């Protein structure tokens, strides 16, 4: 079996990959290691390759990796990153060490897009695409909770995909999350509010070092939440919110002043007000007053790009159910993951 693989060094690590993947180059990095570009000689297109080193070394790693495999396999939507291939170089359960995930290749993450010149056309489209992908996830009960610019990728044609499937420091986490409260689908709409806002102002809306500093920077801006929210926190946490200085915050006029948008064409102040509006529907601390995914898609700023084939797609059929709520021994995870890698390879 070993005749099918070759190895190349990528910085520190060794990528042992099927011979169909040629010319690996590093395209980015993160927790789960380095990610490469490659040329797939079979499909005759460029692809992306992610190496998972011992996805089964401990419960957290295994649970996360297994879920991602299964979900990436069964989900098929243009705004969610698609699985092209998955393989392992080791030739038996015992030797089994590593998992390689082969994806569609994109050009950059959202961090770069923010440090970059934009307009309403492209901004509205990027936001429209994010919403589509989210809606799709929600339609299968996947609620992300952890959307950030680094896990969202774009292509030069301005197309966008979400790199991962969220939870089963954090600037973009919704207030209802930093405060250990209940959440619904629109918890992800907070994240999208932060990202939008961040594109506009060029910099992070709420840069806290921990959970404490994070929350304060939110009330400082939008103001202390209503009495109807501060007593929605469990006794312990409802103690903090009614224990720190109370601010009035700013209007979304002061947070996102006219000067931040192009105000030439009559229709460019139109878009400017439309954009400001959506932000205020999204960055609502109280997750009950907050706009929903279906609502945003309808909002005038966004809906110009509406297409039912992409905004209203059939939900994924996730065939594992117990998925993201099962517990196994490390040895059982190794089996599950290996099994799933073997079954999913083309």
């Amino acid at each position: 079996r070993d005749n099918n693989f070759y190895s190349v060094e990528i910085g520190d690590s060794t990528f042992t990959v099927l011979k169909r993947y040629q010319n690996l180059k590093p395209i980015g990095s993160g927790a789960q290691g380095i990610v490469c570009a490659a040329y797939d000689a079979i499909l005759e297109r460029n692809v992306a390759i992610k190496k998972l080193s011992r996805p089964f070394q401990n419960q957290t790693h295994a649970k996360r990796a297994y879920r991602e495999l299964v979900l990436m396999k069964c989900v098929n939507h243009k705004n969610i990153i698609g699985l092209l291939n998955v393989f392992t170089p080791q030739k038996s359960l015992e030797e089994f060490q590593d998992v390689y995930i082969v994806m569609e290749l994109m050009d950059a993450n959202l961090c770069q897009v923010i440090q970059m010149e934009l307009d309403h056309e492209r901004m509205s489209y990027l936001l429209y695409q994010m919403l589509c992908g989210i809606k799709h996830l929600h339609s299968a009960g996947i609620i992300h909770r952890d959307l950030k610019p680094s896990n969202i990728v774009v292509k030069s044609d301005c197309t966008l995909k979400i790199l991962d499937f969220g939870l089963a420091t954090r600037y973009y986490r919704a207030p209802e999350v930093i405060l250990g409260m209940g959440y619904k689908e629109n918890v992800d709409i907070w994240s999208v509010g932060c990202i939008m806002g961040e594109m506009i102002k060029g910099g992070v809306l709420f840069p806290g070092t921990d959970h404490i500093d994070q929350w304060n920077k939110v009330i400082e801006q939008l103001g202390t939440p209503c009495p109807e929210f501060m007593k929605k926190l469990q006794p312990t946490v409802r103690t903090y919110v009614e224990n720190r200085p109370k601010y009035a915050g700013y209007s979304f006029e002061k947070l996102f002043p006219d000067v931040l948008f192009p105000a030439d064409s009559e229709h460019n102040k139109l878009k400017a007000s439309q954009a400001r509006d959506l932000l205020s529907k999204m960055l609502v601390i109280d997750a009950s007053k907050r706009i929903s995914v279906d609502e945003a898609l309808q909002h005038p700023y966004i809906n110009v790009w509406y297409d039912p084939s992409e905004a209203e797609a059939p939900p994924p059929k996730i065939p594992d159910k117990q998925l993201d709520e099962r517990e196994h021994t490390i040895e059982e995870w190794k089996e599950l993951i290996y099994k799933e890698v073997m079954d999913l390879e083309e």
Partner: peptide, 12 residues
Amino acid sequence: RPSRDHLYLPLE
């Protein structure tokens, strides 16, 4: 529906 063909991000 407006065209998405010309939309470009200088990333290449």
